[PDB]
Design an enzyme around this catalytic site. Structure first.
Site, mmCIF file in Angstrom:
data_model
loop_
_atom_site.group_PDB
_atom_site.id
_atom_site.type_symbol
_atom_site.label_atom_id
_atom_site.label_comp_id
_atom_site.label_asym_id
_atom_site.label_seq_id
_atom_site.Cartn_x
_atom_site.Cartn_y
_atom_site.Cartn_z
ATOM 1 N N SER B 21 11.546 2.966 -100.512
ATOM 2 C CA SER B 21 12.169 2.534 -101.730
ATOM 3 C C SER B 21 13.219 1.799 -101.820
ATOM 4 C CB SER B 21 12.132 4.008 -102.740
ATOM 5 O OG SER B 21 13.361 4.619 -102.363
ATOM 6 N N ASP B 136 26.123 12.919 -111.248
ATOM 7 C CA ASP B 136 24.941 12.073 -111.141
ATOM 8 C C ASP B 136 23.521 12.739 -110.965
ATOM 9 O OD1 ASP B 136 23.528 9.760 -112.025
ATOM 10 O OD2 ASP B 136 23.701 8.877 -109.904
HETATM 11 C C1 LIG Z 1 18.879 7.860 -95.756
HETATM 12 O O1 LIG Z 1 19.779 8.511 -96.859
HETATM 13 C C2 LIG Z 1 19.446 8.938 -97.956
HETATM 14 C C3 LIG Z 1 20.181 9.424 -99.021
HETATM 15 C C4 LIG Z 1 19.546 9.749 -100.064
HETATM 16 C C5 LIG Z 1 18.245 9.840 -100.488
HETATM 17 C C6 LIG Z 1 17.510 9.600 -99.454
HETATM 18 C C7 LIG Z 1 15.928 9.702 -99.444
HETATM 19 N N1 LIG Z 1 15.447 9.026 -100.468
HETATM 20 N N2 LIG Z 1 14.051 9.345 -100.373
HETATM 21 C C8 LIG Z 1 13.075 8.678 -101.432
HETATM 22 C C9 LIG Z 1 11.978 9.934 -102.115
HETATM 23 C C10 LIG Z 1 13.862 8.097 -102.477
HETATM 24 C C11 LIG Z 1 12.160 7.849 -100.880
HETATM 25 C C12 LIG Z 1 13.753 9.978 -99.461
HETATM 26 N N3 LIG Z 1 12.487 10.393 -98.844
HETATM 27 C C13 LIG Z 1 14.884 10.340 -98.749
HETATM 28 C C14 LIG Z 1 14.924 11.032 -97.495
HETATM 29 N N4 LIG Z 1 16.042 11.429 -97.129
HETATM 30 O O2 LIG Z 1 13.813 11.084 -96.615
HETATM 31 C C15 LIG Z 1 17.964 9.161 -98.121
#
Ligand SMILES: COc1cccc(-c2nn(C(C)(C)C)c(N)c2C(N)=O)c1
Ligand SMILES: COc1cccc(-c2nn(C(C)(C)C)c(N)c2C(N)=O)c1
Ligand SMILES: [Ca+2]
Lengths: 279, 283
Positions: B21, B136
């Protein structure tokens, strides 16, 4: 260089302090943190020693520095003149030892979960070996492979009893990169068979003697049924892992590369179904 | 005090890099670490946009806890900058609540554990020294792990997006607004409402600015039979929690510690087995 400090926990913040087990490293108790509102586990040895303090602080530093998905997460340290100990996440499902050997409590431990456990043990140890400088466990046993709420592995009690996981070259005093994989080969055998290594042996010295002469836990149809998934591959991993010559034992990287195709065969739902079966 | 250093991860150590995303704070990708042999998530983007990455890294590294997204390392190269965290296979709470075709059911015990876990995470931040304030909290940054346990991420505010989780007094920000220890509980209350109802807050009002006026007056998301059925476990005590949390006066809003104490007996009414059954139902 981005740094994180280990929180200091006041002993008065730990309520409902209940005994769980007493081991060589210390006494493990379950509790609940008054402020954070989570169950925890506490490890403590009343006066102890001047050198005994240097041990507890060393384990805490190790856990704090070796933070990873398959390493027991340390939450804080109780450092008071009145009480000394380490606080970690509470592991509700005990040790791999209990799961493997409490057969009336667990009649069925489905293959996918056994393989996931083996995969996770190797992932944690591999992570240790990849630190700078490399951290060696040197005390891998089923007793310190802990199981969290979903039966995921947390490796504890490391670098820094039972000699069944100790390689033959360790018996004599030594001046040691291939130790852990030996221990892991035994654990693999134990996980796949649910049998105690060297059942026929009373005295630990007879085990030590047999192991120095190249003998290992038995591999036949009785110990490892022919219906075990990926049997041949697992047997090769075990036999190379516990080989007499340390040089002939694989790295954890090679070991993981061997396990990866096996783990891809199992659907994510099958792990969940294996766990619900245990409840 | 004992110090743990965050590992520096060379970018070339990340393989099988796939886009997931595009967010306000950066682009999120999935990958596998070549040496560690685990799946990971990578968040990436002059000399000013650089300090924001480093800040979130430091916060994630200092705020380590069971319900906070675990950071694994940082990519810090002239060629590439970004953070590496544990990969969350089940996305955000937002996608769980609003993808109704993909998720027909979200069993009550799971919903309550999600709520209990958000509260445990935020509470932990609030209990650090000095207190870390989220500011947030939204459903989009409550992440769900392999077995649908909560991981709180995105400490970027500790163009923008949604306003529905922001308390009225924070609309025109000041010195008092940024130091308000009662911002998060308002967000939690809206989240609680959203979780229990699987409804988009202020659905009637299709104009974002109008929502902001309504909220100023004292209006909140609709608490009736239509949004929140009578069958909802512990309905009364939850509505009490919601309404006190999103109260117009910040002084009347409870601490997370108090909300937890109220939640503890509620969570104990659900048998362990049901949490597992809920996850299997979603899978
Ligand atoms: C790599 O750092 C991050 C920080 C904050 C969120 C995410 C993250 N967002 N998503 C979405 C749901 C927004 C695609 C994931 N699947 C994340 C993850 N950690 O796997 C990653
Ligand atoms: C508090 O520090 C530790 C360190 C190593 C192991 C344990 C621990 N042992 N057990 C036993 C299975 C040996 C009782 C648990 N359930 C532990 C835990 N972290 O929950 C705790
Ligand atoms: Ca389905």
């Amino acid at each position: 260089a981005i740094c994180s400090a280990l929180p200091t926990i006041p002993y008065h913040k730990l309520a409902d302090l209940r005994y769980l087990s007493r081991g060589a490293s210390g006494t493990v108790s379950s509790a609940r943190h008054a402020d954070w509102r989570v169950q925890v586990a506490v490890k403590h040895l009343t006066p102890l020693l001047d050198s005994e303090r240097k041990d507890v602080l060393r384990e805490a530093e190790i856990l704090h520095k070796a933070r990873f998905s398959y390493i027991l997460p340390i939450l804080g340290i109780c450092n008071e003149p009145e009480f000394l100990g380490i606080v970690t996440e509470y592991m509700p499902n005990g040790s791999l030892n209990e799961l493997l050997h409490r057969k009336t409590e667990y009649p069925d431990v489905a293959w996918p979960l056994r393989f996931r456990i083996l995969h996770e043990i190797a992932l944690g140890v591999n992570y240790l070996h990849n630190m700078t400088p490399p951290l060696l466990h040197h005390d891998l046993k089923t007793q310190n492979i802990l199981l969290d709420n979903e039966f995921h592995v947390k490796i504890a009690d490391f670098g820094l009893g039972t000699i069944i996981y100790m390689p033959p070259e360790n018996y004599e005093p030594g001046q040691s990169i291939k130790h852990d994989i030996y221990s892991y080969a035994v654990i693999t055998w134990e996980v796949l068979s649910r049998k105690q290594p060297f059942e026929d042996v009373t005295n630990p010295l007879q085990i030590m003697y047999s192991v120095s002469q190249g003998h290992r836990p038995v591999i036949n149809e009785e110990s490892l049924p022919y219906d075990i998934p990926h049997r041949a591959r697992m047997i090769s991993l075990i036999e190379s892992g516990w080989a007499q010559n340390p040089d002939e034992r694989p790295s954890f990287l090679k070991c993981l590369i061997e396990l990866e195709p096996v783990l891809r065969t199992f659907e994510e739902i099958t792990f969940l179904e294996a766990v619900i079966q245990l409840k």
